[PDB]
């Protein structure tokens, strides 16, 4: 029958010049939507709402689906430019996009060598 | 009537302390002699080893043989007599096995027409005597 659309609204708003960002709460209305709605679709729509050059300046996380309904609420961050986004965003959030630091060795091995090198000098 | 003082709380406190030793229920919970004489050191159940199977007669108006066993406890090596319930159920006991023993009710008082027996057999070889009776399990 009918098509499935998505509408995005922002209830609370705040401008953060200390961390070069603006914060808000995202509301998504998706009546008739099948399944959930991936976060990249929100990023497209939020970019339309506040026209940004690069959609990667937008961050969305912590989204909860309302019981027995077609609503979903999450948090949202907007950065002035990509340079500020890289500096301030936590690593695991950048890795979600696919552009964070590679990896680190298992923590067990690191603390194993730390005690081993306590028996030796130089 | 009795003392009605408004400054006589000392006399009323002493009276209640002295007279509270006169009821057997309150005395049993504050005297430590019951725990020592009790084969279970104040515990719900205890584990023991079967020594032999005995048959004790019932009291006078009744007439039967009550099919008990003689059990030596493990935690303190005391000897007690315990009753094995339900029909049959003696063939599931055997000799030198290890059993779990519980009270009979009434907290140390003998029960029914069995003379001087206040313990019952619950588990044999750690399976469950009633489960064996209902065939829900097999003897290891």
């Amino acid at each position: 029958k009918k098509k499935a659309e998505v509408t995005v609204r922002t209830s609370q708003f705040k401008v953060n010049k200390l961390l070069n960002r603006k914060q808000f709460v995202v509301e998504v209305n998706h009546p008739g939507w099948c399944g959930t709605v991936p976060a990249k679709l929100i990023r497209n729509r939020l970019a339309s709402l506040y026209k940004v050059a690069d959609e990667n300046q937008i961050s969305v996380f912590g989204f909860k689906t309302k019981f027995g309904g077609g609503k979903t609420t999450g948090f949202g961050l907007i950065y002035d430019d990509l340079a500020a986004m890289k500096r301030i965003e936590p690593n695991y959030r950048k890795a979600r996009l696919g552009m964070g630091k590679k990896k680190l060795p298992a923590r067990k091995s690191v603390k194993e060598r730390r005690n081993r090198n306590k028996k030796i000098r130089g | 009537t009795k003392t009605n003082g408004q400054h006589a709380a000392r006399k009323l406190v002493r009276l209640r302390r002295k007279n509270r030793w006169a009821d057997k229920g309150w005395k049993k919970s504050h005297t430590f002699v019951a725990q020592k004489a009790n084969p279970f050191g104040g515990s719900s159940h205890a584990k023991g080893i079967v020594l032999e199977k005995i048959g004790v007669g019932a009291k006078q108006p009744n007439s039967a043989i009550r099919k008990c066993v003689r059990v030596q406890l493990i935690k303190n090596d005391k000897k007690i007599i315990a009753f094995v319930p339900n029909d049959g159920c003696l063939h599931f006991i055997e000799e030198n096995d290890e059993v779990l023993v519980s009270g009979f009710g009434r907290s140390g008082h003998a029960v029914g027409d069995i003379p001087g027996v206040r313990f019952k057999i619950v588990k044999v070889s750690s399976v469950g005597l009633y489960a064996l009776y209902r065939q829900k399990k097999e003897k290891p």
Binding site: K14, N16, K17, L18, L19, Q23, I88 | -
Partner: protein, 260 residues
């Protein structure tokens, strides 16, 4: 020599949830007491939601963006107390720490001229080596040459950007005070009288603006001015007037109904 502070043992006015974490930031020693203050990490992360996590407050405080007495502070666990000006020059907002009518911390936006003024309460007057009269203050400041009329209970109006004393407000019946401890914290009223009780705690009897009467220990009043109008600083919304609990409940109920 403790270094932690369990959540449940923290002051209630920080309003930290008991379901979020086990610990709280212990305020380092300094101008104000541990019980009678709130730290800079609390203000940045809990009062104004500039920072979400506690790592972000470091990203603000370690740069010296926040100032607390005209000097930027980099320590999150800095103790900030009553009558303190907090200004963030990048954002342009300045708050003064005061007590609201219910005895809780209140941050009220002040003007540019006001942000350079601070009120202090004398607690001790002594002599230094040589003959230097120096007076200690409720926030720990020491003033080298005060007015020779200063005494224990009075208050001083202080310029923070440049260190000097503006004027001294003594104690007496006419003046108006604000209660700073004892479940009457956050009430403004005049001094009806003060009772001596030598060797023990003096009792000061005060009259509210609405004609009510209340009393408290004399070590809990902070004289603001000689009149309500002549206040060097700004004041919170209610002006320290408390009203009946049933009236509070009823006004809240009807106000919600007209709102929707």
């Amino acid at each position: 020599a403790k270094k932690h502070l369990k959540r449940l043992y923290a002051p209630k006015d920080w309003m930290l949830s008991k379901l979020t974490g086990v610990f709280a930031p212990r305020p380092r020693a300094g101008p104000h007491k541990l019980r009678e203050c709130l730290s800079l990490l609390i203000i940045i992360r809990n009062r104004l939601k500039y920072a979400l996590n506690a790592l972000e407050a470091q990203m603000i405080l370690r740069q010296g963006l926040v100032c607390v007495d005209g000097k930027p502070r980099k320590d999150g666990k800095y103790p900030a107390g009553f009558m303190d000006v907090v200004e963030i020059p990048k954002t342009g907002d300045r708050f003064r720490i005061l007590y609201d009518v219910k005895g809780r911390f209140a941050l009220v936006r002040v003007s540019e001229a006001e942000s350079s003024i601070k009120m202090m309460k004398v607690v001790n007057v002594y002599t230094g080596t040589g003959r230097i009269p120096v007076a200690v203050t409720h926030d720990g400041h020491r003033i080298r040459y005060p007015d020779p009329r200063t005494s224990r209970g009075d208050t001083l109006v202080y310029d923070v950007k440049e260190k000097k004393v503006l004027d001294l407000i003594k104690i007496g019946n006419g003046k108006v005070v604000m209660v700073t401890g004892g479940a009457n914290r956050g009430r403004i009223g005049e001094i009806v009288s003060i009772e001596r009780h030598p060797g023990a705690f003096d009792i000061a009897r005060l009259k509210d603006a609405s004609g009510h009467e209340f009393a408290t220990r004399a070590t809990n009043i902070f004289v603001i001015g000689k009149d309500m109008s002549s206040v060097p600083v700004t004041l919170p919304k209610q002006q320290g007037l408390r009203i009946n609990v049933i009236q509070e409940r009823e006004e809240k109920l009807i106000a919600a109904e007209t709102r929707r």
